Amino acid sequence: GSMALFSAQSPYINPIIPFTGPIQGGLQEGLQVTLQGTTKSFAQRFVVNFQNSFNGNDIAFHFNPRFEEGGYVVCNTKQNGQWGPEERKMQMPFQKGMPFELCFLVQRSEFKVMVNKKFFVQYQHRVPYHLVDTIAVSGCLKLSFITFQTQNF
Amino acid sequence: GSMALFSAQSPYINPIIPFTGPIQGGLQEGLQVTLQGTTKSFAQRFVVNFQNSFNGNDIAFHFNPRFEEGGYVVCNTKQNGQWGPEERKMQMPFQKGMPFELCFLVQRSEFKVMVNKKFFVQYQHRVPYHLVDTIAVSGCLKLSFITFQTQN
Numbered sequence A: 001g002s003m004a005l006f007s008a009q010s011p012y013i014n015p016i017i018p019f020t021g022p023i024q025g026g027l028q029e030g031l032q033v034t035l036q037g038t039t040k041s042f043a044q045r046f047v048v049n050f051q052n053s054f055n056g057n058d059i060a061f062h063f064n065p066r067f068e069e070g071g072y073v074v075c076n077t078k079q080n081g082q083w084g085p086e087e088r089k090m091q092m093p094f095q096k097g098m099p100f101e102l103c104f105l106v107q108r109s110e111f112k113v114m115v116n117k118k119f120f121v122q123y124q125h126r127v128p129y130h131l132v133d134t135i136a137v138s139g140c141l142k143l144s145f146i147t148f149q150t151q152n153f
Numbered sequence B: 001g002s003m004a005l006f007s008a009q010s011p012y013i014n015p016i017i018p019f020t021g022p023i024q025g026g027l028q029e030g031l032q033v034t035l036q037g038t039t040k041s042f043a044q045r046f047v048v049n050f051q052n053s054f055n056g057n058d059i060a061f062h063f064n065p066r067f068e069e070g071g072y073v074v075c076n077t078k079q080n081g082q083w084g085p086e087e088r089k090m091q092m093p094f095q096k097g098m099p100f101e102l103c104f105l106v107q108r109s110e111f112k113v114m115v116n117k118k119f120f121v122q123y124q125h126r127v128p129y130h131l132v133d134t135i136a137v138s139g140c141l142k143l144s145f146i147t148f149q150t151q152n
């Protein structure tokens, strides 16, 4: 790509869904988390959660495509079990049955989310990203890799 | 506020709604456009448009509170008369019948929107903001003023 990237931790390969796993050392500015997978042919919804610990009470960033009402994506944060105000992008960048690349870039003030190489949505951090130590993926997809890379030398 | 602010263009004081007027010289990085006003007691919707010319066909940033379905705000861009994909924040930071301060900060890659001095939404620039030379405000509100300020 347009930036030199270096491995952080090692990839999750054909991780079975639902998948929960560590983000080693926590999210860090300049980190890129890329999921490569396929939206299932009769997909209704799927979920990527960047969370603090395993119980899902505290999800810094919930990313939830919904193949409903024309197709839209919900982004939100859960704190002490409580969902905050949703940010809905009224567009569906995934296609049922089709492969996708979904990349999450951690910046100082926001996540930037690309789908198939194109900017899709920004999400302002509501809670500290460094406290996210877990990724959880569930729903109507399959995945061939999750990789973790950084631009930081 | 936490930083000294200086006028960039004189205010529009008590502008009559619907209001359309110049943003003299176009939007600039670092400009803050502040609307001080009151949401009407039975508001349905109101609109703040940052647009290129009087026409309305090209709206860089359409900011549209809707007192509908629990309350939500629509952000979008219009290009050649066509609406792009809506960004909806499913929260209503305005109260019907109540004063508000609504502040748009032009940053290099996004607008930042503050409501009553709290961050409300960000909106990534889809077209260069400097082509915006016109503000249009309409709907269920009144304004005491619109100011244009910079940290300058």
Ligand SMILES: CC(=O)N[C@@H]1[C@@H](O)[C@H](O[C@@H]2O[C@H](CO)[C@H](O)[C@H](O)[C@H]2O)[C@@H](CO)O[C@H]1O
Pocket: A062, A064, A074, A076, A083, A086, B090
């Ligand atoms: C219109 C509206 O606000 N709808 C919401 C639902 O989106 C919400 O569903 C939950 O949403 C969260 C993220 O906010 C997460 O995706 C949950 O899986 C999902 O069930 C619902 C219940 O919280 O409230 C509705 O009214």
Ligand SMILES: CC(=O)N[C@@H]1[C@@H](O)[C@H](O[C@@H]2O[C@H](CO)[C@H](O)[C@H](O)[C@H]2O)[C@@H](CO)O[C@H]1O
Pocket: A090, B062, B064, B074, B076, B083, B086
């Ligand atoms: C759920 C959905 O996508 N609904 C949209 C409406 O929001 C839209 O209404 C228009 O929205 C634009 C900004 O996007 C502007 O606020 C107009 O005043 C409003 O009429 C409608 C027509 O474009 O499409 C619906 O599908």
